[model samples]
Target: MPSQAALLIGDIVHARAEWEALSSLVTLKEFPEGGREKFLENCKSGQYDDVIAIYRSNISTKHTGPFDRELISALPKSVKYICHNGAGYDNIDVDAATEAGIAISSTPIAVNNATADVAIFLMIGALRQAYVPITAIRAGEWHGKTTLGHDPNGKTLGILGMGGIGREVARRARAFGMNIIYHNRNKLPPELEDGAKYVSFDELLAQSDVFSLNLALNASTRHIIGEKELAKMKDGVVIVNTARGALIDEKALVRALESGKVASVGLDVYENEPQVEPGLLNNPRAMLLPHIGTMTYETQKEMELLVLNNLRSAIEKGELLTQVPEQK
Candidate 1:
């Protein structure tokens, strides 16, 4: 019997070794290379039951989207499982996929450590005023005492979400001699707290000296940190975000930075994305990075292998290894 068909969305060339392994078990249909019209034409044939959607930050075109409503509607009804490559599935509409009887799984486990590393790196960099000093060095203007920066030691580090990535960040923050506090929808178990305190959202804002955003972006969380929330934070509070960009109001952040209400900002993701706010670009205090939280070589390989595992289990055994929590 022939292996079942699997549609490969986005470019699979980066994971060439894994794709070679996957091709041995399933017939593959690569997209875009043959042109969009041909890919959509093949979808109408109703031959594919499994999909592996990978999003590389380098490609930002509409066709690269895994859950563009138009693309989803054009997919064959045979598509039962979609194994996404990244940790966040904000690109896809999970509720719509669930309602349609399609299962979705993400690679959260693979991303946990690497993303937390970025958060810690950003937090430290922002607090230290690392950007201005580095810029001064590059500009050949050496001034020893340009601006004074604070230490992470003895400061309260407030985390917005206490999920896997958040916990990892807390663990690292503890090593730096910083007190950890967090706010989540539900408080974590005592043992999981790792000596970190659970505080109300208002308290989190009021007390945090260095604030980190580690939450997912959804309807409720989009622009969760805005003018009012920024106002609540202690003066000269440093901000770090490794989560989705939509979680922070970029305009409000710019205003806060302008008024010196916020001391420094470090971000890995942006709201508009690929087209950042012009103000953020102009600010020396803002340390910006392209969305590369989980881009480490080891993490990408682990994530790709997990995606393949999710596809294999879903297609062959009628289950997924790490399905989205809603399905469970």
Candidate 2:
């Protein structure tokens, strides 16, 4: 069969109808059962010669491993675009895709709201060291050693990477009476800024009562927060991160927590995933989650729909709806 679209990993769920609607636009191909080796062999055999575009969900990493240089090189020349079903496309090698003359798009906006919501939830939970109380209750001890925690009211929140999720966090943080400030590569003009003060990275680190991290993980961003950065923060400051882990050095964070420099932390993502650092896992001051930032029903449907939309738009309009920053 001559296929124009390939489902490299994961299946369509909530957006099945939207995916089906693209039937006339593409001859769909599915790789439901195979590892990277088999996938590579199929490509070598010209099994995907007619494929022009690819659809990838977050689970692509697990099924076919990272879309690294080898896989990218093996891609059929007919392929020109890859529409990803999640905000982060770190698993896909953008440089390799660019080398292959393939542009990539991701579902960034659809995930912003849901991820921001989790950030807020984690912020307050960590602020109160809520984990200890919950664990104590589960062990049949109510309110066991639950200390008085600070509130968000009248506090300062310094945000890093004021993009989709960062801006959303600012909007929600305002309702809590927290003064919001942000630091980005270039200042976001006032309209998009929406009153969130633009501060320097140094100022944000020093003055914020609470610091929120919402940045992508790339070569330059990994371990952006380490020992020296943590030392500059106000003593006993709360921290929250819904973005990629490794944004903060886990070892440095553990050390800071021990010194009482960092009061508490709320984290949804981790550096190694499924294998959390022992220091963070054992500490009650850490409110950790399994990276369920965009796991809500509404966000899930919206993300799947956006991916299909990008696929269809690429076929019809010769452009992606939301291309990733690297490809753009």
Candidate 3:
């Protein structure tokens, strides 16, 4: 019998512990998720000339040039589908996958609520200056000094993208009595619109008391929120980005924070991710996370099962689920 060839391409930490159960169903090889050169080297090292499918890993929001190209070339010629384990597939090269006759997939639905919750968490955390008070207390520096914060109620919340996750955050903000405004590629239906006043991208930047980045990461969106957009936002407006970090210019954002033009920023993703400008750490107005936008228990399990199912369906079942444009 011919040996079955299956390689898991992506990073595995605590997530690796679950692979044992997964391996029982298929022969599984592992590598650090998105460890491009290592993964390609592994593919070359293996004697197999072909693979049925390549289930890619590291399909987070860090969709950049280097990560995308590296992962694409790391698979065997027979690999069929590239299953991303998260809601974002901006990191994967869709055109390359499509040209190569591979299916690309993602798990966006399961993460809507979880990621939206994080967006709200960042909004409130940034506006309220949550981290500062806690850190000061931790360091025994809490004295008469007041940690400044912005009021959210009755304020305007500008949404950068009106996708599933963005709408979820909007729903919560609406309940809090904040005026909702959004800028989408196109207008949403009336039912989904629900008083979300649509505005031009520039208008959203200008009028919003608080602005959140909830759009996709692609060619059009990279560095979308640079100094120009930041300058357009209402002075002292709070900003939140629970999505990819490459959407904004890092240096410009830091300067905004320093100059107090940007009241606060709640960021879960950064330009390089896990490698942010040092100034952000010292800024009281910035609330940051380790890119855990889709880290809820339910979403995590659902995401894993979804990715596995996408891979199985594409490779073994010969069906495509959640067809990504690049992987069509």
Candidate 4:
């Protein structure tokens, strides 16, 4: 069989490392316009000749709903498969891809470690008033004014969804001597639960000292952390989200931050990625990260290899190593 040709939609990172491994084995093509209209036009005109596989990420500025719909609709009918770079697939219309018989995949296992690392980073930054003090010092208000910082020891660390990433976060928090409280639709097995207490959503919200949102994003979870949920948390409790941004209500979070309901926010993802609400632009009460929870040097290379593995397996071997399930 001929070498499987592939198109990388977004700017794939760890280029110094990834391409060195893949370029020698496959026909790797990079979009000049960086996954915009021009790239799609090329895809339609057979510009990417013999391209049998694609690697797309939701990280691009041009990746709107319409663009995704069009990309799936306009596919050559010859392209066999696609692999998303991260765990989140809300940006992709999986239903449409299924109807079209195109296999879709995500790096779920790869996401676990990196996302969990981010959760830890958020938990520490938010609870301890990490950023506020630095900002106060920068503004020269430290000597006369005051700031607050909370300790992790013996505090209840409530996990919204105690799945892979949540469990990992729990394991780390245990090292800090925090009590574990989790809320999940289905309780984890005995061995996996590992002595963590499972509680009702309201109870977890009411009791938790640090509430972490680590659930997947979909119809059931979209805006799940709105004003009502935020209102339930213990006052002065830190809120952290290492999962999808649409999972939380940005407007409500801003309001909570303003009204002192949510003491501080440690956010790795936002509703408008790369662009946040004007109010949060320079806000002191929150620590914002640019959706880079999984950008570590090690994880980036692993993700690239996983993408390559999925691509080669699907296009060359007629297999998709990690296919996504059909959503309801």
Candidate 5:
């Protein structure tokens, strides 16, 4: 009724390309770069009905004060939803938002393809020992001193989660002549499995020549892959993580590498992110990235547009197009 006011927050770079599209659709007010206090003060004035947060990397929890009970309750009663830019909403207190009757949505589908690509990238990079060769050439050890790497052809790939992203990863892994096996809390439909075998957690670890962590992060799933799990994995197993870093225990991973239980690991996320464990920093067996799982140009625009669409829909129709599980 009042132009469906929406407040924009966070670093803002993620949505730069779609700013005109967003502004053209709704009356958007961005939190000034250096004025968080003023921004919240304006939010409390009851002028906004929605919030579109670009929650990523360093700017995840910034600008928007903790999305806890106190913060949610303090916002204007007219505020109906918070559209988180990323697929993961671990930073937001969904329970608190639910209690306050404010819906929360994330761009899970928009990120599926790009994130899956990174998973595959890491999977191949780690298995083929790309890092060793790159570093060897840089250090002028260009001769026949480097060891050979493994091939994914006909190898078993054990995926930990079978969500949209995991399924996409399975599709790509299949192209490389890899056998796909997955372990999820609940089994996927036969059609969705697409020839991928459903195995128990232990079986997934034991049978996998290459293991990929694609599970969601929560209390139960945090540190899901620890020492015991790593020990169960076949020796010389390569791990690829495009999911949350906390999903794997960093300390145990380092130990596994040192002891040769795990041959190589490629990660897009980390346990204590932006501050990788010292053990992984210089280790040739560890190939790490700065969590750019869904940073591609196409995916970034898609994610921002999805957030905008969610904001517009929730404010106008009283429902989100892609609500989080808590809201559902």
Candidate 6:
């Protein structure tokens, strides 16, 4: 019998033991230190033709660009599955994978709590406009230009895309006395809604004092919040996004902040990674984090373990443990 292999596309940082354990199932393959060009050349050279499954790290986007149409089509004929290590597979081409007869899995379950926690942190920080004092204290300037901020208590928190992360954020926000309202593709059952009211999309934009984005980034959802949508929102609103940054147009967001339409903003992700809009970075009320929502040791390890679980199940059971919904 020919040797079948499992390819690891990037370095596994937390669940090394779990990944190493998979070597017992299939021959391990890696292209450790190559950029997209070199990796594509290696793929063309037929080194990965025997690769049956792949473990793709979220961080590997830098190394392999995106698992886009061109790369997905170029994957070896033996490839059947691509187990990815992040909840947001925006870097991957789901349509191309489907056409290539590949199933994809992501760590959405593992990331729910961590991502929600960051959303809440941003929600509260932006409401309080804490970033100003956070920067001021270090410079020996006390509350430099600090203005009174709103309290979460009794304010309507409108959540877009009420999925796992959204529900988790809702549960936490309730404890802080915030009223939860949400908009989803379909209204969740009463049990799942858990006291959060369902509203129309335009109603959500109009009524929310604090608007939180917790949706996936895709063709349909990209720029879901832009100039027109921003115009409908309540003035002096607080916006918090722990989901993908592109969900809101950053340029539009900057203008909203500058014009005093948006009171403050809290962001962990940006339209461009590592390069935030200068407007956001310079604005004192813009609470920013470097997309470290899932960077906790526990959550990071859980994410890695979940990817390993998907990889192992794909190889042993002919199915992924947590395949992405688009494939289903």
Model 1 residue runs over 4 Å out of place are 1-3, 32-42, 45-62, 66-69
Clashing pairs in 6: none
lDDT by residue (1-328, candidate 6, tens digit) is: 3788999997898888888888898899886668999989988999998999999977988889899999998899899999999998988999999999999999887888999899889888898789888878888998787788888899999999888888899999999999999999899999889889999999999999999988888887889999999999999888999899899999999999999999998899998878999999998787889998999999999999999999999888898889999987
lDDT winner: 6
What C-alpha lDDT values do all the predictions have?
A: 0.79, 0.87, 0.74, 0.77, 0.79, 0.90
Per-residue lDDT of candidate 2, residues 206-300 (tens digit): 98998988787888899999999999999999889898888989889889999999999999988888788898899987888999998889999
**lDDT measured at residue 28 in model 3 versus the true structure, 0 to 100:** 71
TM-score sort, best first = 6, 2, 1, 5, 4, 3
Which candidate ranks first by TM-score, i.e. highest? 6
Error of 6 at 195 (Å): 2.1
TM-scores for the candidates: 0.91, 0.96, 0.86, 0.87, 0.90, 0.97
Model 6 — TM-score against the truth? 0.97
Ten-residue region with minimum lDDT total, candidate 4: 59-68
Off by over 4 Å in 3: 1-4, 11-27, 32-35, 45-48, 59-67, 70-74, 140-144, 326-328
**Residues 125-236 of candidate 3: C-alpha lDDT, one tens digit per residue:** 9888888776777788883244667678899999888887878898999887899999988999977777789999989999899898776788888999999988888889
Candidate 5: how many backbone clashes? 0
The deviation in Å at residue 122 for candidate 1 is 1.0
For every model shown, the clashing-pair count is: 0, 0, 8, 0, 0, 0
Compared with the true structure, what per-residue lDDT tens digits does model 5 show for residues 1-328?
Answer: 4355566666555566555465655666766354446656766776554443222222546666566666676766666678888888787778888777778888888888999999888888887668777777888887325567788999999999988898899999999999999998888999888789999999999999999977778899999999999999999999999999999999999999999999999899999888999988778767778999888888878887887777767655778888888668
Across 122-224, the per-residue lDDT of candidate 4 in tens digits comes to 7888876667776677888873344657789999999988877888888899998999999898888877787799899999999999888877788889899
**Ranking of predictions according to lDDT:** 6, 2, 5, 1, 4, 3
Q: Model 1: what TM-score?
A: 0.91
Report the Cα lDDT for candidate 1: 0.79
